[PDB]
Amino acid sequence: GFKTINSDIHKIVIVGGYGKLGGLFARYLRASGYPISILDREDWAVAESILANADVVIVSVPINLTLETIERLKPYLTENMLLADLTSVKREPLAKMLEVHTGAVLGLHPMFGADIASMAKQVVVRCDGRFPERYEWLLEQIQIWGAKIYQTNATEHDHNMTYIQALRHFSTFANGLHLSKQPINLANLLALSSPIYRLELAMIGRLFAQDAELYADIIMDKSENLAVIETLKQTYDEALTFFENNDRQGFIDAFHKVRDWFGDYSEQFLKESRQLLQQA
Amino acid sequence: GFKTINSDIHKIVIVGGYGKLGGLFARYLRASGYPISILDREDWAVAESILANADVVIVSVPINLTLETIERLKPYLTENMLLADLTSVKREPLAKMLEVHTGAVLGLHPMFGADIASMAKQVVVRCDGRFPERYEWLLEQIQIWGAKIYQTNATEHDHNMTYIQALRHFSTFANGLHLSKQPINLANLLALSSPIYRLELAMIGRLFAQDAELYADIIMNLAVIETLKQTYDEALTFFENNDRQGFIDAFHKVRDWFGDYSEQFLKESRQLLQQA
Ligand SMILES: NC(=O)c1ccc[n+]([C@@H]2O[C@H](COP(=O)([O-])OP(=O)(O)OC[C@H]3O[C@@H](n4cnc5c(N)ncnc54)[C@H](O)[C@@H]3O)[C@@H](O)[C@H]2O)c1
Ligand SMILES: NC(=O)c1ccc[n+]([C@@H]2O[C@H](COP(=O)([O-])OP(=O)(O)OC[C@H]3O[C@@H](n4cnc5c(N)ncnc54)[C@H](O)[C@@H]3O)[C@@H](O)[C@H]2O)c1
Ligand SMILES: N[C@@H](Cc1ccc(O)cc1)C(=O)O
Ligand SMILES: N[C@@H](Cc1ccc(O)cc1)C(=O)O
């Protein structure tokens, strides 16, 4: 149960609302006192009646269907409505929402999966479209759940996701792929693993419990993503050289330079990770 | 304070005892009622008196100095002593301990760093050298502190460390190296990061807070890192060829290799972060 920030909101439609993320937001919104209607894959025959008199429309469909879904909403949108999305990429969905709708437009990116037990300390990225004064209530509602909002423009958002998501999930993918080809039994590795070592494997394996299509569409979104993963391969080759050459001091010098780049974050991360495992 | 499993142990010598791991073991053993003498980098001129009447000698020096350090102990060792190590590699240190000492010999590998706040649920690998009946007390003592003992031979230990340590730390090293060359500011990435995404970066940056020498010696294994290089290529090909279904099919096959561990790891990681 959560405080209802805006009691003048009488109907919220979630497009893709039987999905994992859309469903999660539907639950949180219902628990905050807002009536929710769902428009999912088999409901378009009655889109007109589902969307009729909506105050808010939220789009949470597969990345590769998002832009066509936004266009499909066009005939049913009225100017008083808020149009928003939850998509992992922002530049193109935000531009498309602003093109199809003349009213308030808000881009969101929840930086978490649908398996969260609570919204406490989870981050949602805010990219303004139009009329932010009309949707302040929704940003405040999300914070009532305990989430934190961070604001960027949609282009900067996607630029940062190049590193945060495309690079990182590509890398984890390659690590899991590699492990899967090795002549080893995972349970044998786990028996020798203390908590930190178990967590090393968990951070790789947990990726594969999720939807392949999500990670495919994130990584494939733009040519900057291909470019950054091509450079990861070049760096892997550079790192390898130290071990082929048995150049222990070269490795150490590089390790020390990388520590200076992290700065005090290296020691903070060591501490945070230890505390995470100690409690648990 | 921990229960003293064996009250007949009157002197334990830790070679490398002012170090991070040696110092940690010295603190646990002192707290378990065992008198500790330290033999560190400067102390070899008085090694005769340090090692005199020792019941146990534990080696905890840099990996690259470990075998020559064991060799250097031979003149001060007597048959009744227990000789043991904490080294991250087991096959060469164990053999060299069996070579220079006629008495009880035990190989240990603590699977953790010195910054632990307790031994609860930490793993120590056990590789028997000689006369395990003589050192059961110490295996029990370590468990009194809350650690788990897992037993293997030194060859199988070393084989598993290829994957658990060499592979994983090399890959984390290459990822931090790569990140350090990107046109980004870490604080800015962190401000967009929910707890799971902060942990993605934490798991890389925390490597670099530790001793570069340790990871250099552990990694230097080459085969598995060279094959990782081959897998990076296969993975990249999906994105270069815009082969989405290929990627999805490969992702599904990896999930099947992890089996139910994928979902268990998703749950464990969620729980770890929610507790925080
Ligand atoms: N699950 C996550 O970790 C996560 C995290 C952040 C953002 N997102 C975003 O959520 C969206 C994907 O949703 P999900 O991850 O919950 O996956 P999902 O597959 O579980 O949900 C997607 C839903 O959209 C529905 N759908 C498909 N075509 C439709 C159509 N034409 N009209 C209406 N509904 C349609 C599906 O039936 C499904 O219920 C993407 O925008 C993605 O970037 C997901
Ligand atoms: N630190 C870890 O996370 C970790 C984990 C598991 C195992 N280990 C093992 O710990 C051992 C020691 O490393 P540490 O991590 O505590 O690093 P460290 O540098 O803190 O400790 C090494 C100690 O050995 C001393 N030393 C150097 N040369 C010596 C010599 N000739 N004779 C006696 N002492 C000497 C140093 O002065 C120092 O006090 C290695 O065998 C390593 O594999 C370390
Ligand atoms: N990467 C997150 C889930 C997620 C996926 C895609 C996103 O856009 C955001 C979050 C996790 O593994 O838990
Ligand atoms: N890898 C552990 C520390 C460690 C290092 C070497 C070892 O042999 C064992 C454990 C960590 O990052 O916390």
Same domain, A115 and A226: no
B273 neighbourhood in chain A, CB within 8 Å? 276
Distance B112 CA to ligand 4 centre (A): 5
* B102 in A contact zone (CB under 8 Å): no
**Solving technique for this entry?**
X-ray
Query: For A160, which of B115, B192, B266 is closest by C-beta distance?
Result: B192
Alpha-carbon torsion (A226, A227, A232, A238), positive or negative: positive
Chain centroid, CA B61 distance in Å:
13
Distance, CA of A72 to CA of A67 (rounded, Å): 9
**How far away, in angstroms, is A198 Cα from ligand 4 center?**
12
Q: Is A62 in the pocket of ligand 3 (CB under 6 A)?
A: no
Q: Do B121 and A195 touch (CB under 8 A)?
A: yes
How many Å separate Cα A45 from the centre of its chain?
30
Task: Answer whether B206 touches A (CB < 8 Å).
Answer: yes
Which bin fits A88, alpha (ψ -120 to 50), beta or left (φ > 0)? alpha
**The tokens 């791991």 sit on which residue?**
B21
Residue of minimum CA distance from atom 12 in ligand 1: A62
Compute the distance from residue A211 Cα to the ligand 1 centre, in Å: 10
CA A215 to chain centroid, in Å, comes to 10
Same structural domain for residues B172 and B264? yes
CA A74 to chain centre: 26
Alpha carbons within 13 angstroms on the beta-carbon side of residue B220 total 22
Using the beta-carbon criterion (under 8 Å), do B233 and A238 form an inter-chain contact? no
- At A127, give phi and psi (nearest 5°): -125, 110
Taking CA–CA distances from A245, the nearest residue in chain B reads B220
Residues B139 and B79 in one domain: yes
Do the Cβ atoms of B274 and A208 come within 8 Å? no
Token pair recorded at residue A137: 């209530």
Compute, in angstroms, the gap from residue B19 CA to the centroid of ligand 2.
Answer: 5
CB A243 within 8 A of CB B222: yes
Distance CA(A70)–CA(A241), nearest Å, equals 49
Domain end among B104, B135, B159:
B159
Number of domains in chain B: 2
Nearest to B269 by CA among B208, B188, B198: B198
Task: State in Å: Cα A136 to ligand 2 middle.
Answer: 56
Q: Do B33 and B118 reside in the same domain of the chain?
A: yes
Any CB–CB contact under 8 A between A231 and chain B? yes
Task: Write the residue with the smallest CA distance to atom 5 of ligand 2.
Answer: B113
Of the candidates B146, B113, B135, B108, which has an alpha carbon nearest to the alpha carbon of residue B124?
B108
Are B149 and B202 members of one domain? no
Same domain, B11 and B97: yes
Closest CA to A208 of B74, B110, B257, B42: B257
Shared domain for A136 and A173, answered yes or no, is no
Residue B253 to residue A180, Cβ atoms within 8 A: yes
Q: Is B180 on the interface with A (CB under 8 A)?
A: yes
Resolution, in Å, please? 2.0
The CATH number of residue A187's host domain is 1.10.3660.10
Q: Whose CA is nearest to atom 12 of ligand 4?
A: B207
* Distance between CA atoms of residues A110 and A127, nearest Å: 12
d(CA A60, CA A70): 10
The CA-CA-CA angle for residues A71, A72, A76, to 5°, reads: 105
- Could you give the 3-state DSSP secondary structure of residue B43? coil
Same domain, B236 and B131: no
Query: Does A45 contact chain B (CB < 8 Å)?
Result: no
Neighboring chain A residues of B178 at a CB cutoff of 8 Å: 231-232, 235-236
Q: How far apart are CA B108 and CA B274, in angstroms?
A: 34
A59 plus A155 within the same structural domain: yes
One domain, residues A174 and A146: no
Question: Bridge partners of B127?
Answer: B107
Same domain, B181 and B141: no
Question: At a CB cut-off of 8 Å and minimum separation 6, what does A97 contact?
Answer: A59, A70, A83, A84, A85, A105, A107, A129
> Could you give the CA distance from residue B97 to residue A100 in angstroms, rounded to a whole number?
76
Among A143, A159, A175, residue at a domain's last position: A159
Count CB neighbours of A193 within 10 A.
19
Instruction: Report the side by side order of strands in the sheet with B123-130.
Output: B36-39, B12-15, B56-59, B82-85, B104-110, B123-130, B148-151
What the block records as the tokens of A96 is 């498309």
A42: tokens are 């088999």
Return the exposure string of B43-60: e unless at least 16 CB atoms fall within 10 Å of the residue's CB, then b: eeeebeebbeebbbbbbb
Query: In this structure, are residues A127 and A111 in contact, taking their beta carbons and an 8 Å threshold?
Result: no
d(CA B157, CA B92): 12
CATH of the domain at B67: 3.40.50.720
Show the beta-strand stretches assigned E in A72-122: 82-85, 104-110
Angle among Cα B221, B248, B270 to the nearest 5 degrees reads: 70
Give the span between the Cα atoms of A124 and A130, in whole angstroms.
18
Domain boundary among A109, A126, A159: A159
Q: How far is CA B178 from CA A23, A146, B172, in A?
A: 37, 34, 10
**Residue A228 sits in the same domain as residue A91:** no
For B63, the domain range is 1-159
Diameter over CA atoms, chain A = 70
